[PDB]
Design a protein around this nucleic acid. Structure first.
Ligand SMILES: [K+]
Ligand SMILES: [K+]
Ligand SMILES: [K+]
Ligand SMILES: [K+]
Ligand SMILES: [K+]
Ligand SMILES: [K+]
Ligand SMILES: [K+]
Ligand SMILES: [K+]
Ligand SMILES: [K+]
Ligand SMILES: [K+]
Ligand SMILES: [K+]
Ligand SMILES: [K+]
Ligand SMILES: [K+]
Ligand SMILES: [K+]
Ligand SMILES: [K+]
Ligand SMILES: [Mg+2]
Ligand SMILES: [Mg+2]
Ligand SMILES: [Mg+2]
Ligand SMILES: [Mg+2]
Ligand SMILES: [Mg+2]
Ligand SMILES: [Mg+2]
Ligand SMILES: [Mg+2]
Ligand SMILES: [Mg+2]
Ligand SMILES: [Mg+2]
Ligand SMILES: [Mg+2]
Ligand SMILES: [Mg+2]
Ligand SMILES: [Mg+2]
Ligand SMILES: [Mg+2]
Ligand SMILES: [Mg+2]
Ligand SMILES: [Mg+2]
Ligand SMILES: [Mg+2]
Ligand SMILES: [Mg+2]
Ligand SMILES: [Mg+2]
Ligand SMILES: [Mg+2]
Ligand SMILES: [Mg+2]
Ligand SMILES: [Mg+2]
Ligand SMILES: [Mg+2]
Ligand SMILES: [Mg+2]
Ligand SMILES: [Mg+2]
Ligand SMILES: [Mg+2]
Ligand SMILES: [Mg+2]
Ligand SMILES: [Mg+2]
Ligand SMILES: [Mg+2]
Ligand SMILES: [Mg+2]
Ligand SMILES: [Mg+2]
Ligand SMILES: [Mg+2]
Ligand SMILES: [Mg+2]
Ligand SMILES: [Mg+2]
Ligand SMILES: [Mg+2]
Ligand SMILES: [Mg+2]
Ligand SMILES: [Mg+2]
Ligand SMILES: [Mg+2]
Ligand SMILES: [Mg+2]
Ligand SMILES: [Mg+2]
Ligand SMILES: [Mg+2]
Ligand SMILES: [Mg+2]
Ligand SMILES: [Mg+2]
Ligand SMILES: [Mg+2]
Ligand SMILES: [Mg+2]
Lengths: 131, 386, 62
RNA sequence: GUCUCCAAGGUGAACAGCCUCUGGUCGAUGGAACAAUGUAGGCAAGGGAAGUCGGCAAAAUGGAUCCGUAACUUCGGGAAA
RNA sequence: GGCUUGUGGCAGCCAAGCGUUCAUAGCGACGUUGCUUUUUGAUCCUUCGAUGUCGGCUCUUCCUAUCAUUGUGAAGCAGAAUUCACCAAGUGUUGGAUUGUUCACCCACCAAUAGGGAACGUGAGCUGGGUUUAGACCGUCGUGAGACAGGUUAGUUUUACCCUACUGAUGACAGUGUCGCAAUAGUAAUUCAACCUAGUACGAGAGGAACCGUUGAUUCACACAAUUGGCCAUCGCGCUUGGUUGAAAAGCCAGUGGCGCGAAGCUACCGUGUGCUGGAUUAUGACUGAACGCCUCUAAGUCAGAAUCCGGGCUAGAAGCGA
RNA sequence: CGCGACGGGGUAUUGUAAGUGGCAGAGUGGCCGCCACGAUCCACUGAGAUUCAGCCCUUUGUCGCUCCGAUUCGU
């Protein structure tokens, strides 16, 4: 099995990423990252596969003014694969889930990173292309 | 009053003072514990940092995400031509620590080592060890030399050999003055150590006799020099706001009112780099023996005929032609800097230490740019022989 | 035999342990041999127009 | 700090800025190095005000042509919205 | 700052009662004994030929009355969680909205978001939002000039080259050089998660662990540049605006004209590698064993034992020393 | 005795030099197909330029210099 190796962190707090599911949300505003113990003055940051707490700044009214967990599926900051290749996506994206990692939506638009798929089987099930 | 918020201090107080090292060659502060039941063997070796490259290997780590997968990891090339034993020194255990009892030298010393004893070799008369070498030419003198060796066998508790590098064989270094150091002999009784040392007088000891493949070693040397440096770069203190009068690359408060003195724990600007360092647990991925396929960059999977040296040569170093070691990770010091290799002082039992390395690919593209050709022939064939 | 990829922009051979991989929004995968090809690709330059690229040479029968 | 007269060519709306001709001038103590700190000028992956009393500073916008232009209004404006 | 400690804060003794039963697992009414100077007062001893007067930022060190982490005792401790107490300050104690704030409050993360000192640490370190000059407005007060521990807006933050401290740099250390020993001083690692154990122990059920082991990660430290990323006056090559050399060609000027790429060098948790082992012990639980024919971890004598201590390792190397 | 100054090769950056030719080129002006103008395009040409200044190798080849000195130090 094994755990995922560290990745370059490209999404600090206040980052606004696209919503990759069909829940009705259009973007996700990151307010915190789970698992961060932190350092003085250091902004919490997330990478592909990290669970974050976010708010919907643009979308259906039912999803706004609320704090919900989400998972990052794409990022623009390049990160190093163990095979020495640096990868990056064209945009930053995430999907809204519940505290147990189950997708709130039912479909995912666009590809998702392989790192996120391994950690979240529910997200991988609804994914189209896993790269 | 107490500081508003808590964060760890910047820098380590265990590496003070941050001064220029009083030596250029890495000094062995501690040798491996001696086990008499083992055969006599050297514990250290000198090498020269040639450069870095990356390799690809298939990992065998059960329970790991990388199990049966390929990983790319940086390696450092250390050219390690055989060393020449030129003397032996014995120490006696005293209530005031180890004291040097006597030093016995070989009859013949090379010009390269003799240069180490002069500040201007060419202008001197080159009288070093001339009178000493004569007593090897008389029966009474030979008896005296043997008597000194017997004296070491009787009183010495620690035996070290005097060994120097053959720096002439690496023309890239542009240096003729060889490096000399004491290498401790571990294993066997004191008599065996003296016999072991005396038997190697004027002979060569290859790096393979000290180290081998897949073992953990310690690398000792002096870091790259960087001169006078400010606190932000030297100690890692955060920068001050943009609108700070008189500059922002500073420590704001260097101490409370009391004690009415600046403490030694406060970050201050000064010398950065050129510090003596001892780094542990560097795994040996490959040992290249001249005249053998191990010296080339061939692998069981990549059969391309090519040498370890990247096309165009190792930058600022040259072409590696002698024995070398491929060491995982990074090595202290600049290119061409002499480094000291030491056997691990700990008992290596972790799975990483016992992992069997199997290289798939060794990159030999040019490191003076975005190299895309592994061999000169490949480049020439690409451009229709150019 | 080693598995080597090809640069999508220049057509250069990419040896293991390096390379830049870009995933376009339409799930297309692009492998670049260096930042030179990456920057030109993101600047919307066509390889067919650059003399040194393999695509240019194939079209011009070089 | 201190009144006023004469005022070439090119670019351009323009005695704007940039370059040039007539005329004037190289007058600012020099030499060797290229550390920290500084002053002045820059740039920067991913994020984008999370910094800070406060977007301070900087960045972004910028010319011209065509289209198009809301609330409000004292009917003139707003408007280069 | 000093004396004092009423007040503020922290702690103990007695045992009425609470606690289904049951004074003392956990609490302690009525009383009573103390500690503390991180509250505010009391005083007016020092300073008015001046000790720069709020807070934040930055940075180090110190304390323990211990929030989390290591080892344990107790319980109205089945498990899980929680509570009380002991040795313990080695390591850590965060990102934000509103407020000038200290204080507070909420959102979120976390193993945890404990409390304090250092001239209410720290302005020739910054900042100047507040307070606390001169301009100005409001309310109330005053006949008025004007007043307001009321509100509001604008309002110059000077000097180090001296001595010391601290940081590094030469030199001195009795010919010169090489290789070494070494007193002593400094010192560093840290916490979490997943898998397995295990849906097991325990429990009516609900619920629900742990050591070993494996694989990663956080904070930190020291290096390093193969790869990716960043920086250009390589003024390296190309492109290009205005001017200019009669054109072409080739250049130059606009203090780096501008733009694209850009090796080298430097460099980033934005990249990569590495980060250690014995001894003696604390709490505590025990062995043998009297005093006290029994009993008893204690009196003599012993054992196990920790984020402890000392050493080792790592950094430095003395008007120290050896070959 | 190697070093040093050129040069060559290796390596790398940019992206195909100048000159010549073209029955390439939107077209246009003269003459009786020819002549002239024309940004750009194609061939020679992955060409040319630059490449240690802190890159690597080095006579195939060229050239120079190999040491005038000064200050001290003794059991
Ligand atoms: K946190
Ligand atoms: K403080
Ligand atoms: K660093
Ligand atoms: K900062
Ligand atoms: K400077
Ligand atoms: K802000
Ligand atoms: K009191
Ligand atoms: K006063
Ligand atoms: K000061
Ligand atoms: K003003
Ligand atoms: K001597
Ligand atoms: K020590
Ligand atoms: K670079
Ligand atoms: K040409
Ligand atoms: K060409
Ligand atoms: Mg902060
Ligand atoms: Mg603290
Ligand atoms: Mg030591
Ligand atoms: Mg330097
Ligand atoms: Mg200022
Ligand atoms: Mg390179
Ligand atoms: Mg005009
Ligand atoms: Mg003008
Ligand atoms: Mg940026
Ligand atoms: Mg960007
Ligand atoms: Mg934005
Ligand atoms: Mg804010
Ligand atoms: Mg803030
Ligand atoms: Mg505010
Ligand atoms: Mg502004
Ligand atoms: Mg308006
Ligand atoms: Mg009281
Ligand atoms: Mg009471
Ligand atoms: Mg006074
Ligand atoms: Mg004063
Ligand atoms: Mg003062
Ligand atoms: Mg205590
Ligand atoms: Mg219970
Ligand atoms: Mg502490
Ligand atoms: Mg006080
Ligand atoms: Mg104060
Ligand atoms: Mg001060
Ligand atoms: Mg001040
Ligand atoms: Mg202040
Ligand atoms: Mg103010
Ligand atoms: Mg006023
Ligand atoms: Mg009145
Ligand atoms: Mg004000
Ligand atoms: Mg000590
Ligand atoms: Mg059961
Ligand atoms: Mg021209
Ligand atoms: Mg001029
Ligand atoms: Mg300019
Ligand atoms: Mg790092
Ligand atoms: Mg007993
Ligand atoms: Mg006891
Ligand atoms: Mg014991
Ligand atoms: Mg050359
Ligand atoms: Mg040189």
């Amino acid at each position: 099995a094994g755990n995922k190796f560290r990745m370059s962190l490209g999404l600090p707090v206040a980052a606004t990423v696209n919503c990759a599911d069909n829940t009705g949300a259009k973007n996700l505003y990151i307010i915190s990252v789970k698992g961060i113990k932190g350092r003085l003055n250091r902004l919490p940051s997330a990478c592909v596969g990290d669970m974050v707490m976010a708010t919907v700044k643009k979308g259906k009214p039912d999803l706004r003014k609320k704090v919900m967990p989400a998972v990052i599926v794409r990022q623009r900051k390049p990160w190093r694969r163990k095979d020495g290749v640096f990868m990056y996506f064209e945009d930053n994206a995430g999907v809204i889930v519940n505290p147990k990692g189950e997708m709130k939506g039912s479909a995912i638009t666009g590809p998702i990173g392989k790192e996120c798929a391994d950690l979240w089987p529910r997200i991988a099930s609804a994914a189209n292309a896993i790269v | 009053s107490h500081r508003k918020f808590e964060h760890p201090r910047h820098g380590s107080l265990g590496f003070l003072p941050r001064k220029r090292a009083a030596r250029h060659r890495g000094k062995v502060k501690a040798f491996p514990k001696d086990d008499p039941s083992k055969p006599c063997k050297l514990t250290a070796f000198l090498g020269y940092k040639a450069g870095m490259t990356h390799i690809v290997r298939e990992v065998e780590k059960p329970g790991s995400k990388l199990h049966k997968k390929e990983t790319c990891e940086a390696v450092t090339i250390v050219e390690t031509p055989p060393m020449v034993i030129v003397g032996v020194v014995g120490y006696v255990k005293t209530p005031r620590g180890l004291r040097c009892l006597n030093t016995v030298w070989a009859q013949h010393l090379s010009e390269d080592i003799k240069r180490r004893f002069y500040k201007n070799w060419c202008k001197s008369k080159k009288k070093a060890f001339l009178k000493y070498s004569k007593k090897y030419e008389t029966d009474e003198g030979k008896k005296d030399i043997q008597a000194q060796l017997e004296k070491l066998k009787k009183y010495a508790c620690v035996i070290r050999v005097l060994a120097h590098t053959q720096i002439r064989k690496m023309k890239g270094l542009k240096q003729k003055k060889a490096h000399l150091m004491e290498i401790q002999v571990n294993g066997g009784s004191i008599a065996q150590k003296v016999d072991f040392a005396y038997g190697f007088f004027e002979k060569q000891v290859p790096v393979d006799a000290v180290f081998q493949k897949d073992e953990m070693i310690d690398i000792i040397g002096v870091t790259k020099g960087k001169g006078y440096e400010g606190v932000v770069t030297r100690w890692g203190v955060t920068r001050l706001p943009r609108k700070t009068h008189r500059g922002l690359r500073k420590v704001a408060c260097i101490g409370a009112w009391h004690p009415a003195r600046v403490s030694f724990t406060v970050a201050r600007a000064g010398q950065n780099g050129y510090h003596h360092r001892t780094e542990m647990n560097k795994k040996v991925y490959k040992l290249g023996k001249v005249g053998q396929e191990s010296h080339t960059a061939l692998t069981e999977f990549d059969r391309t005929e090519k040498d370890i040296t990247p096309i165009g040569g190792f930058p600022h170093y040259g072409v590696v032609k002698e024995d070398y070691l491929l060491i995982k990770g990074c090595c202290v010091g600049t290119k061409k800097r002499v480094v000291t290799l030491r056997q691990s002082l700990l008992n290596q039992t972790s799975r990483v230490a016992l992992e069997e390395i199997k290289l798939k690919f060794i990159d030999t593209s040019s490191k003076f740019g975005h190299g895309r050709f592994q061999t000169t022939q490949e480049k020439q064939k690409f451009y229709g022989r150019l | 035999v080693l598995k080597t990829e090809l640069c999508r922009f220049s057509g250069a051979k990419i040896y293991p342990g390096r390379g830049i991989r870009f995933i376009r929004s339409d799930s297309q995968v692009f492998l670049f041999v260096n930042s030179k090809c990456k920057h030109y690709f993101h600047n919307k330059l066509k390889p067919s127009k650059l003399t040194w690229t393999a695509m240019y040479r194939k079209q011009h029968k070089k």
